[PDB]
Every structure is written in structure tokens, then in C-alpha cells.
């Protein structure tokens, strides 16, 4: 339905896919990274029932479906399901497809090599894209934030990367890969809500919990004070209506789940916590770099939407950082949608038009070309 | 509209704050240059005392 | 359990602690420089379980422990864990109580002063050792190798000190200290194994990668040609059995890891490599010294056990060195254990019996005495 | 912006380049003698970013650059980097094209011939300067300091030249060129700051140590008594602010480094120190010269900017000198700038206008002409 001869952009994780076309400042639509399948045998005639559901179809019908997510902590392994997700995304809902447009897909800086190779290959071989470019989420996070310099706290669905860039250059030894993201926070909340008498086991139930979390949970500027009160009084509880007519209230659990980011030990993870990983991405860089990264701590990805996270992360780093120097967190409304936006910026910059793999070079070289042309 | 006015007011605050901070940086840079000018003045005056003393 | 009041020698690196008694040709036991602590909540009652595990205990029970190293880049910062390691090392496994034996410890000459001062203080105040002596790795390496003259390039776990000695004399103006060591080579390997689909981020995983490195990696005498085929075919891969039944193979990662010794830029360090630092330590010595140091290039420390390292280092110096001069590398099987062996040699030399600090002088002066009596 | 074809003047060392116009009393701009190069891989695009940075550009962007200088111990070995430094110096900061202005460059009296020859060639062939004149740094120091007679003690970044002049004439047999300089002091200080626990091994760190030295260090008059208290109490320590907000305190290191000038053995140099070396230049001169040189020891260059140096040198020289004789040191505020200033003076004097190599004589003879026309 679109007639603008621009690039297309998609951010694909273990939870959601943000997508639209390059040159704008927002995705046109956001789809779940889901291929749904019926988990029941139909009995009655005229009950519909699809063999497969894609994206929002899978999420909307989830009460009777098993929901599969193709991306594992940042890597696409089920490329067949991503092809279905991308077809729906582009052809059915965004109303624009790669066949007539160059396409940019994103990944984390240390994401296994197979991910960028398959993203490049599927757009060229199943979507017939005229050109490709696999982007680094850290690059996109700073473009969308108005920075060339800063720490990218790309807290996604399956992984948080924690990666510094200075004057447009990578500082890779200072990357603190962390196995804690929005999907793990959802799983933890399912377990602590089970402790409150509301067990959540199935994937439809996981989606209910993700909705509860996104609307009711927060990290808190001061965890211990919120905890002591919330664990002692109903005045700190918040109600949510479950899609069966039950009402669930959440007290200190409302923040204990989100707290996992600062205390990963809550889910059995071996990690110093998001504020120390942020601190180390700054501290492991050279001393004439450190000061600029402290002043430019940039949030991207989701989980950045928890109340108290932009104020808390600044508090936790300034408390570890030396005095006089100003420590600042950048946390715009483009929060969680900023990687897509950065993709739009990179794809459309004139300074990037020589970075695209055309369907010339690709056909002669094959998918290994991504390591010659992208990064 | 409340939300756009809010994004604009928040932006105004963000930019105004970016400037509260840029101003505080300039104020401290200038206050520091001033204190240093005054430290260097006190020194220049002390060194003036040494120069006058030398005289 | 010993029948003579010989000195004890304990080589406390940032990696492992080699220890035994003076006068021998090997440590009697090797312990990791580790104190381990549980990162899990106990479930069962009456299970024993320690608050902390020491040395080989820490590795034996590591499945649920986070393992910390008290020594960072060669310097002790956690003296409490050092005391635990030493007590275990000396009293439980080596069976030598320091109270009845003088003790020799080892360190780089540019290792910050707190290291030699704190090690001296602990052996005199918590162990009641009758005497102490903190020895220098360059001295210890030349004794172990049968030399009085040469360059000691200790490519150990912590920091590389690169120190030239001639006719028993230090040539300190020619010391090139490099912030590159075996621990960083391991970290590089973990990131590139992540690129291949094997993500190792927790302690058990980190200790495993170190073991994989030790058995599978090699330097290559031509990085680019070796990579051209390692990156193209399985014929240059080597397998390793992971503790859980899974397997891993390593391709160009097998040599890219040790390559950081020749290319420190791989981990973000501003350096041309261990062969340039070796070259400069020879070159910066007087002109009548240079010829003897070229012919006596001594490899020491661990990582000297990567296949091809002894030969590549001779090639790299020969390529920088003037013609006519003979360039030669010394690389005995007493590699990685050379600092401990040098300690054994030195502690027992008649020429060294006047170098010991007794526990008289120690109390009159305090631990700062190490800077006047040892080095 | 000038209203006359005044000569351009530049004083180019291994440290910094001071530049301006003849007839002024200070340089118009000072640059480090540095061309910087990025040591990191660019990740973002449309970031600007140069292949190389020059002078202050190299310093401002130093957080990610390796910084190299073209001048070693007083001689330019990398003319390409000096060409870039001069182009920037002349066209961007001095705002002048040398084509319309004659240029005065400087070198030490015993500096290898290639320096003055290459400098002459580049200014005539790449800048098309109408004339050239390579000055004696000692001459320039004497004019700026108000003397015709004395020992020029430049003690610069490269070398200490120690050159006696009487009635405006060289006494070359008595020049004690010494390989003891400001760049060795920077290296020594970082080794002793390493002893204190602060590692300085990268370029940014090296330049920071240079800045620490310049602001915190001194020689004083009595090393042993100063050390007796500096080594015993924090009351003689001074804090230095590192760029990331952290601090380093420096104690007896504050003077142990500067002490190298009186004790060169601290950096492995076979020398009696600057006070004895100054004395020897006087002693190698005739007795009817010596009386005027003793009374006129004159400081120039740099490192002569250490507190207590003019007063300690007078004490140390008078202690070697014959009795009755008056020993005095001239140590003007025109310190560190006096060689450049002398360049401005020599160029503005009418007594010097016949000394220029014209761009006629130059092309007929070639750059070797400098050895017939300058000194
Ligand atoms: N209101 C919110 N509260 C808490 N967490 C949130 C909120 N919004 C987003 N997040 C988390 O972030 C995830 C989506 O963010 P996003 O970074 O765009 O994922 P991706 O990079 O894979 O596209 C969700 O799974 C959710 O767990
Ligand atoms: N075959 C090998 N391959 C690669 N690295 C090795 C090998 N053997 C030892 N090293 C490494 O050398 C380091 C040991 O340092 P070491 O010199 O023994 O310190 P210390 O002298 O105090 O014992 C560890 O990082 C270890 O992994
Ligand atoms: N306060 C100071 N303390 C220590 N060293 C100094 C001080 N001031 C200048 N120097 C040193 O002197 C050198 C600069 O000398 P300079 O004469 O300006 O070079 P050039 O001869 O090329 O003009 C640098 O190494 C600088 O660090």
C-alpha cells in the first residue's frame, strides 16, 4: 500500500517483532514473534480452527493454542517460523515487502554468527529482497537516542547486551552479555504469583502474566523500603483482572520480579546485576572514554519502562561513580521502540548507502557475505 | 493532545533540563575558572608580594 | 610430614598456586588460586555444606559455586582468601606447617608494593613463619632455565612483565610491562566460542573453557594462512568432551585465542604483542648486552605450552632483529612451572641464605621491611 | 592577517610544537608534536572520523587514538607527520600560507644533520617558503633570556644539550650532550606510579602521566630529607584528578622522578647528572671564559620548570666550582617558551636578515645548502 522507495526495517526478538519502513520515526506495527498451533482436536463441524496462526493471530487465539517462539536469547533457530512471521508482518499487515525494497534486520553484537547469516539468506532467497544489511542493536540504540557515544542498555526479551560505543567506535571488551531479559522476568513472576495462589503454567498463562507485569510491575528507586511496606500492607497492592473473571492482587511481588534485573540471583542467575554490568561497560573503557560514557548512559529495548528504572539506574551508577562528574540516563518515549527507530535511521542515512549487500554480490558470494559487508 | 502537549512539555523540560545541566556545566566551568582565576590571583598577588618583596 | 626444616616455596599466581618445598624439582601439589562460595539457597537439612570452599575443594564442588580469584593481574587484593588458600595448601595437603619452615613467595618486579608487603605480613602474622623472602619472577625464571643472562617473557595468567637480566643484573630501564595475559586469552576465546554457538557465561562454563583452551589451542606460525583453511574446513578442527556429554569443536578460534599474544588489539589493548615487547627489552639494553639477550630469549610462565609458541617467538624476533645476531629461544618442559622451580632453587642456594627476613627484623620494622630486604 | 611578510617561527620537539610569527613574544598556538590514529574499529556510520588527527585534534580525540610523535631525542625521523603538523599549524591556527612568509625552524648544535636538511627540504618543496633558516636553540635561548654568555640548559623532552657560548660564540668542544630528558621522566614516573597501584600503559595514560608530572612534581633542594618525610607521611602527598573523576595521590614519587635529573641512573643512564654535566661544560672551557660561564648558567627549554631547580642547581654547581667565584642561575618566566621567543627575536633582528637561504639558492644547490648557510 506504500509507494515510498525506501528500505524496510525489523527488530526480531524472543517476544516481539517491531516493524515498518525506513525513514520514519516509529514502527508501523508490532507483532508477536509467534507461530501458534492448535493444541486440541476439534469435534464440532463449523468451528473454524487453523493449522497455524501467525503473530497476533496466535496471541489472540492463545487460550486453545500452543505458542512457539523462534528466537532463543537473541538467535533465530526456527527460521521457518520467522519466515511465516515476516510474511505476515510485511505482506499482510505493514503492507510493504522486501521484494521491492532493501531490508535491514538487527542483532546483538556477540550474537552467534548463524543468526546474521540466516537473516541475510531468508530475505534474499524467500523474499527476493534487492539488498540486505544486518545491523548491530547498539548502533541503532544510540542513533535513536541522539548519541555517537554512550552505553547501550538493550534490555530485550531474551538477552540484555550491555554494550559501549565511543565516537562511533565499538569498545567490545567492555561488553557485559547478560542472560536476563523480559521473558525471564515473566517466568519469575509466574512462579511468585503461584506462591500467591494464582498458578500460571501454560503459555497462554505466560502471556497473561506478561500483561500483568507490563501494567502492574515496577523496579522501585528504593527496593527495601517498598518491599518492607508491600510485604506488610495491602495499601501497596494493585489489582488485575484475569480473563476468567478472577482478580489477582500483587504486593511486594509487584517489584520483586523487576528487581531481578538488579538482583539476578532471584532466578538463579550468576550475575552482578544490571547496574554493575552498566558500571563495568563504562569502567572497562579507557579513562578518557569513561567520563563520556558516564554522562551518556542510554536505555533501549523494553523493561526500561518500569517505574524507577531510569532514576534507579542513575542512582546506582552515580553511587559507584566518582564525584563532581555528571552521570546521566537517557530514557526517551522511544523506549523499547528505539532499536527499530535506530534501524530506520541507519537504513536511510546517506552515509550508509554503500553498506548494503545487493542481490548481485549476495548471489555470487552466498550468506557468508554478511561477514564481508555488514560486520 | 494532553499527551502531545506532555511530550512537548516533557521535551521542553528535557531540553530545559539539558540546559539546566549545560548551564550548570558552564557555571561550574566558569566558577571553576573563576575560583582558579582567584586562586591564581591570590597566587599572582602572593607572587606579586614576592616580586615587590624582590623589589 | 617432611624430615628436614627446608624452606617452603609457594608460587601464587592469578591462575593457580604451585607449592612444595625448597630443594625439590617440582611443586608437591597444585591448588587453584580460588575460594568458592554457594550461589544457591540450601533446601535440605543436615547436608554439611561450607560457607566457602578452598582450592581444590572450590573446584570439586563448583557445580553450584561462584569461583573467585583473590589475585587480580598478579596482585593480591583479598588477603583473607589468600590466608585460607595458604592454610589449606600448607597444612592439609603439602603437610608443611610454616611455623617450622621459612617461606618464599613470587611476584613481577613492577607488581604494586602492596602485594609483597601484604604477603610478607600474612606469613609472619597469621602463619608465624620464622622467615620470609619475596622473589622476582625474572630471577626465578633464569635460575629454572639455567641462565644468568636473558629476557624473561612470562606469558602467565595475570600480567606479563618482560624483564631483561644480564650477568645477574637487572636492566630496569628496558622493562616492558604489558597488560595481556592468559586470563584475557581465555576471555577472548569465550567470546569467539559464543560467536560459534557455544555461549559460556557462568563460572562452571568459564573453568571449562580454560580447560578446553589448554588442550585444544595452538599459536600458528602464520595466522592468516592457518585461518584461511581453519575457517574453511572441519579438517582443522579439534573436538573436546564437555562434562555433561555435549561436545564442542574449535576451528580458527583454536589459534585466534593465542594470537592475541601477537595481537593484543583483539582484547582492546594498545599493544603490538609480546614479541615487540621482547624485542624492545633486548633493544633498550646496552649495545654490548643486546647480542647476549637475543641468543637467550627465555619463555616462562604458562601459555608457553601452546604448540608452536617457542618457535613463533623466535621467528618474530628474528624478523625484527639485525642480521649477524643469533636469535634463540629457551623453552624447557619446566615451562609454566619455572617460577615455582626458580623459587625452589633460590630458596635453597647458599648464596641466598643471607637474603631471608627473619621473624625478628620483621617485627622491629613491620611488613614494609620487604622493600628493603627482598626487592 | 599580518600586515608584513614577517617570518614564521616554529620550535619543534619530541614533546610539543610552539608556533607563531616573528616579532611576537609568544607562540600563536601550541600543539603536541603528534599525529593520532584510531586504534578501534568503527561501528556506527555518518560519524565523521578521520584517518589521522593532528596536534590538538589528536589530543582532543585521544580516548581512542594511538598517539605518535615524529621527533626522537631532538631529530625528526618522520617528516610526513611533521608536514601534517606544520600544515595545520600554519594554515589553520596561525592562518598563514608559508609561500608568502620566510620560515625559521630550530635544532640543537649537535643534532644529526638530517634534521636541519630535511626541515629545509620540506619547507621549500611542500610549502614553497620563500626562504629558510634553521636556528641554534642555544642562540635563541640566550636572546630570550638576556645573555650572550652562559651555559644553555634546555633539559627538554628529547635531550639536555648543555652548551656553553661566550660573547655569542660556540665553544663546541665543551658541549655535554646528555641522553636525559622530559620523556624519560614521564616513563620513570609511570613506573613508580605503578608501584603505588596505578597502571599507566596506554597512550592516553602516558599523556596523563606527563600532565601529572608537569603539575605535581618538583626537585627541592635536599632529596634525602624531603624523602624522609614524604615516605613517612600523607602530609606531603598531592592529589591529581584523573579524567574519569578518580584521583591518584603522589608522595615521594613527586620528587623521585625529577631527581632523575640529578641521578640519571634512575632511568639506566650512565651520567653524573645535570649539575655535574653543566660544571663539566664550564671546566672544558678556558679559565678566562669560565668566570663568565659560572656567573651565567641559564635555564631554558623545559623541566627547568620544576620547583627548586634553579636554586638546587646553583647549590650543586657552586659545590663543585672553585671558591671566591660567583655562581648564578638565570631562570626567566619565559621558561618553556624562550626557545620559540628567541626564534621570534632572531627572525625580527635586522642583524639576521642576511642569514636566510632564499628559494633560489635552495633550488640551485638543493637542501644540503643548509650546512653552508645556517651554522
Ligand atoms: N510496561 C512495561 N513494563 C515492564 N517491562 C516492559 C514494558 N514494556 C516492555 N517491557 C518488556 O520488553 C519486551 C519488549 O521490548 P523490546 O526491546 O522492543 O523487545 P525486542 O528488542 O526483542 O523487540 C517485553 O517482552 C516486556 O517484557
Ligand atoms: N597448554 C596450554 N595452552 C594454553 N595455555 C596454557 C597451557 N598451559 C598453561 N597455560 C595457561 O597459563 C596460565 C598459568 O600461569 P602460571 O605461569 O603457571 O602462573 P604461576 O607461575 O604463578 O603458576 C593459565 O592461564 C593457563 O591456562
Ligand atoms: N612544570 C614542569 N614540570 C616538569 N617538566 C616540565 C615542566 N614544564 C615543562 N617541562 C617539560 O619540558 C618539555 C617541553 O620543553 P620545550 O622546551 O617547550 O620543548 P621544545 O624545545 O621543542 O620547545 C616537556 O617534556 C615538559 O613536560
Curated annotation (Swiss-Prot), chains A, C, D:
Q: Where found in the cell?
A: Cytoplasm, Cytoskeleton
ADP-ribosylarginine: residues bearing it: 177
Keyword entries, A-Z: Acetylation, ADP-ribosylation, ATP-binding, Cytoplasm, Cytoskeleton, Hydrolase, Methylation, Muscle protein, Nucleotide-binding, Oxidation
- What does UniProt say on post-translational modification here? Oxidation of Met-44 and Met-47 by MICALs (MICAL1, MICAL2 or MICAL3) to form methionine sulfoxide promotes actin filament depolymerization. MICAL1 and MICAL2 produce the (R)-S-oxide form. The (R)-S-oxide form is reverted by MSRB1 and MSRB2, which promotes actin repolymerization. Can be mono-ADP-ribosylated on Arg-177 by SpvB of Salmonella spp. This modification blocks subsequent polymerization and leads to cell death.
Its main localization is: cytoplasm
What residue spans carry the region label Interaction with alpha-actinin? 110-123, 358-370
- Supply any other comment: In vertebrates 3 main groups of actin isoforms, alpha, beta and gamma have been identified. The alpha actins are found in muscle tissues and are a major constituent of the contractile apparatus. The beta and gamma actins coexist in most cell types as components of the cytoskeleton and as mediators of internal cell motility.
Q: What is this protein called?
A: Actin, alpha skeletal muscle
| Protein's organism | Oryctolagus cuniculus
From Swiss-Prot, chain B:
Its assembly, as annotated, is: Homodimer. Heterodimer of an alpha (TPM1, TPM3 or TPM4) and a beta (TPM2) chain. Interacts with HRG (via the HRR domain); the interaction contributes to the antiangiogenic properties of the histidine/proline-rich region (HRR) of HRG. Interacts (via N-terminus) with LMOD2 (via N-terminus) and TMOD1 (via N-terminus).
Q: In which tissues is it expressed?
A: Detected in primary breast cancer tissues but undetectable in normal breast tissues in Sudanese patients. Isoform 1 is expressed in adult and fetal skeletal muscle and cardiac tissues, with higher expression levels in the cardiac tissues. Isoform 10 is expressed in adult and fetal cardiac tissues, but not in skeletal muscle.
- Protein's name according to its UniProt entry: Tropomyosin alpha-1 chain
Q: What is known of its domains?
A: The molecule is in a coiled coil structure that is formed by 2 polypeptide chains. The sequence exhibits a prominent seven-residues periodicity.
Organism classification: Eukaryota, Metazoa, Chordata, Craniata, Vertebrata
Q: Per the similarity annotation, which family is this?
A: Belongs to the tropomyosin family.
Q: Which organism is it from?
A: Homo sapiens (Human)
Disease tied to this entry: Cardiomyopathy, familial hypertrophic, 3: A hereditary heart disorder characterized by ventricular hypertrophy, which is usually asymmetric and often involves the interventricular septum. The symptoms include dyspnea, syncope, collapse, palpitations, and chest pain. They can be readily provoked by exercise. The disorder has inter- and intrafamilial variability ranging from benign to malignant forms with high risk of cardiac failure and sudden cardiac death.
- Where, subcellularly, is it found? Cytoplasm, Cytoskeleton
**Source organism, top-level taxon:** Eukaryota
**Reported function:** Binds to actin filaments in muscle and non-muscle cells. Plays a central role, in association with the troponin complex, in the calcium dependent regulation of vertebrate striated muscle contraction. Smooth muscle contraction is regulated by interaction with caldesmon. In non-muscle cells is implicated in stabilizing cytoskeleton actin filaments.
